[PDB]
Each structure stands twice: as structure tokens, then as C-alpha cells.
Amino acid sequence: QGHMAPIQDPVAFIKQMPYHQVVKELALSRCLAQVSDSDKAFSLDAARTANAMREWMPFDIESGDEKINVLIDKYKSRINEFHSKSQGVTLNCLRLYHSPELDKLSRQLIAGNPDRTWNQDNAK
Amino acid sequence: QGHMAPIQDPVAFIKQMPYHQVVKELALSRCLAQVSDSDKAFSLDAARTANAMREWMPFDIESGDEKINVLIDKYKSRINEFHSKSQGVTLNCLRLYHSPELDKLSRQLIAGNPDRTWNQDNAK
């Protein structure tokens, strides 16, 4: 009730990002898909969001898929030794998203300069 | 099988962030909690992750809770008019997370300098 109007360009905010950041958005979204119920609407939404990111960057799909997925696998299942009741899978995905490892990989998986944006390459 | 060892300080990566960024982590995590099934393990995990962020920043809880939540509400339910099958609730939360609006609010809700870090204030 009292819902806001539809979003006209859903990926406008992605198209303004440097490509290395788009890779991180894909990685985060897929991590979230993998740590939630594969047979649920949220997990499916996150998976499709991750996959859709590839349209907006010159991503190296053939090698990049498994390189990203192996890295996700190194973060997503960690047991969090919290100090002083959930497992913190969301926290694991955030740790991945901010990791130096993902930051390094995010630059390697982009054809050309990883600091360019989709808008730069397609709109102007 | 072949699982990696437990994480010793789960929030080490949060403690190194400028406080305004910690607010964004809270906002993203809670957005993810709200767009997933409230009666599911993932949603609960995301909620607890969001709530746990407050320990690591001088956050203005009394006003900040609803200010963050009103902003989440302006992003989370948007209908994405995709060009050329999920609703893209994950995308909505990412849009929130990168929004100028959240960036502005994230600085307003921190006592003192919002560019300081937990480590700066507590460890050295």
C-alpha cells in the first residue's frame, strides 16, 4: 500500500561503476545466492542479479566464472568465532566483498582498463 | 567436506572501516533481511548481522534505526523495469547500498568524525 513508482533504468547505478566494482557486485550477489536456500525465491533473485551483471562489463566469462566461484567458496562457509546465534553467512559474503583478494581478482577479470565504466565505453 | 578453519576475529574487516561505511553495511544487511523470507534462516542471519554492526560504531540508535529503515523502504520494493524473471530485490538493496542518499545519511548518523574507524578509536 502506497508503493513507490517502478524503476525506469534498473542498472543505471551499475553502468556508472568502474568495471572492477561490477565484478564485486556479481561476487557478492552470487555469494548471497549460495548461502541462502537454493530452492527459495531470494536465492534465485540473487543468482539472477549476479548473472545479469555480466551484461554491463567486458568480463572474462570462460575463466572468470570458476575463478570467482572458487574465491566465494573460500569465504562463504567460514565458521565465525564470535566473541562474548546465526552462523553469519551474510557477514561471510560481506567479508568476501571487501577482501583484498576479491579486489585483486576483480581487476584481473576485466578486458582492457578495469577502471573504465559501461557508460564510458557505450554511451559517450 | 574439506572445510576451511574457523574465522578468529569475524569483524576484523568492519573494525578497519570508516564508520560511515559500517552504517552502509548495516543498511545493506537489513535490506537483505527484509527482502527475503522473515521466517527463514537467511533473513534471520542478515538481520543479526545488521544488528551486530552497531557494536563497532558510535551509531545514533534512537534516531538512526528509523532513519535507516525509512531509506531502506524507499529502495527495497521498487519494481525493476528490466529492458529486453525475478523482481530484483537483491538489485534494489545494492542500489540502496551505493546510493548518494545512503552515503549522505551514513555520515549524519555517526557521533564525531564519520571517517574514523573502530580500531582508531579503541585499539590505538
Residue numbers in the entry:
A (entry chain A), B (entry chain A): 24 to 107, 112 to 151
The authors write:
Well-ordered crystals of Rap1b and Rap2b were obtained and the structures were elucidated at 1.9 Å and 2.0 Å resolution respectively. The asymmetric unit of the Rap1b structure consists of a single subunit and crystallographic symmetry generates the dimer. An overlay of Rap1b and Rap2b subunits matches 71 Cα atoms with a r.m.s.d. of 1.4 Å. A disulphide linkage (Cys54–Cys120 in Rap1b, Cys41–Cys101 in Rap2b) tethers α2 and α5 together. By virtue of being longer than Rap2b, Rap1b has an extension of five residues at the N-terminus and 13 at the C-terminus, the latter of which form a short helix α7. These segments of Rap1b are on the surface of the molecules at opposite ends of the dimer. The Rap1b dimer uses almost 24% of the accessible surface area of a subunit in formation of the dimer. Surprisingly for proteins with such low pI values, the striking surface feature conserved in Rap1b and Rap2b structures is a crescent-shaped basic patch on either side of the dimer. However, the role of Rap1b and Rap2b is not yet known. While they do not appear to play a role in self-resistance, they may play a role in resistance towards closely related bacteria secreting similar toxins.
